[PDB]
Amino acid sequence: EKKYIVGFKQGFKSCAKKEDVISEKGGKLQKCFKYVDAASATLNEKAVEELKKDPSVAYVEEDKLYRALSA
């Protein structure tokens, strides 16, 4: 609902580089991934819009829930 994953284009490999793009747009970094070219973040609607439009950013998607497949 306001938890997101922010995917990056090439050349944003360090956490510091990912974190700076997210913060510059008003977002709050949660965790940078190590292999996957992305980071989790909490973002308001303005930050989501601005990140989507940023040339560094490949996507912004909801950090959605997955569930155990057991009764």
Binding site: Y35, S40, K64, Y66, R67, L69, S70
Partner: protein, 263 residues
């Protein structure tokens, strides 16, 4: 042990002397409970912010799942990768953190007995990356039954890089809950599977979450016999030697047969 172990033909491997020794299987679930006098959890890590102990399982499903991997592959080493909390749910990011852990820590097999009707580009990146790293990645296909002609396979089982495991009963009949679609790869026993529970208990659980670790366990058996086969070769052997049961939409390649997959 469960009925499902004989059903998949795991005892043929045990007889030859292959029980999964030196094979590391990461169980991406709700933890694995230290409650048991035997699961030989060799390690783990938690990515649920408010539940930092991977050896505490407050849901019960992670513990059951681990037990099943072990009933198929008795000498395998399990790792508790806690990415779901007490309520059985986790954010995509916590699961990705679990998968990245497994990659970094040279896990041979990832089991994911979890799902969502909707995908995430980052989660597809993680599973794809794990597979490119040589990891066998296995997942429960979903418990969403039938919806017309439509696929009801859940994510991440729906991704091509992932082995999607549906559920049959002891008669080799598909369970009514077992998700369906072109993305379904194989079947394994997933109804009333008896396995380890928290508080030192044992009991039956049902779901594709129970089917998945039979395949993860099978992959460990194959790798212990054939340490030189790649993940691709392990996956292909499981698919290509499966017992055909009926329509691919309902059963994929059919029931895994570990004896036939390993030579």
């Amino acid at each position: 042990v469960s009925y499902g172990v004989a059903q998949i033909k795991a005892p043929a491997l045990h007889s030859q002397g292959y029980t999964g020794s030196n094979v590391k299987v990461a169980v991406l679930a709700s933890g694995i409970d230290s409650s048991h006098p035997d699961l030989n959890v060799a390690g783990g890590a938690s990515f649920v912010p408010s539940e930092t102990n991977p050896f505490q399982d407050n849901n019960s499903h992670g513990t059951h799942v681990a037990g099943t991997v072990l009933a198929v592959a008795p000498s395998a080493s399990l790792y508790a990768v806690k990415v779901l909390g007490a309520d059985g749910s986790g954010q995509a990011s916590w699961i990705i953190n679990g998968i990245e852990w497994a990659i970094a820590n040279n896990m041979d097999v990832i089991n994911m007995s979890l799902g969502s009707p909707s995908g995430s580009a980052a989660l597809k990146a993680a599973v794809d990356k794990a597979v490119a790293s040589g990891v066998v990645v296995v997942a429960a296909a979903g418990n969403s039954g039938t919806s017309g002609s439509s696929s009801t396979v859940s994510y991440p089982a729906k991704y091509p890089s992932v082995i999607a495991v549906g559920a049959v009963d002891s008669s080799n009949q598909r369970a009514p809950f077992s998700s369906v679609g072109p993305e379904l790869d194989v079947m394994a026993p997933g109804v009333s599977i008896c396995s380890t529970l928290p508080g030192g208990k044992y009991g039956a659980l049902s779901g594709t979450a129970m089917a998945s670790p039979h395949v993860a366990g099978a992959a460990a058996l194959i790798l212990s016999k054939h340490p030189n086969w790649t993940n691709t070769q392990v996956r292909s052997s499981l698919e290509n030697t499966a017992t055909k049961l009926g329509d691919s939409f309902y059963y994929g390649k059919g029931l895994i047969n570990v004896e036939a997959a390993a030579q």
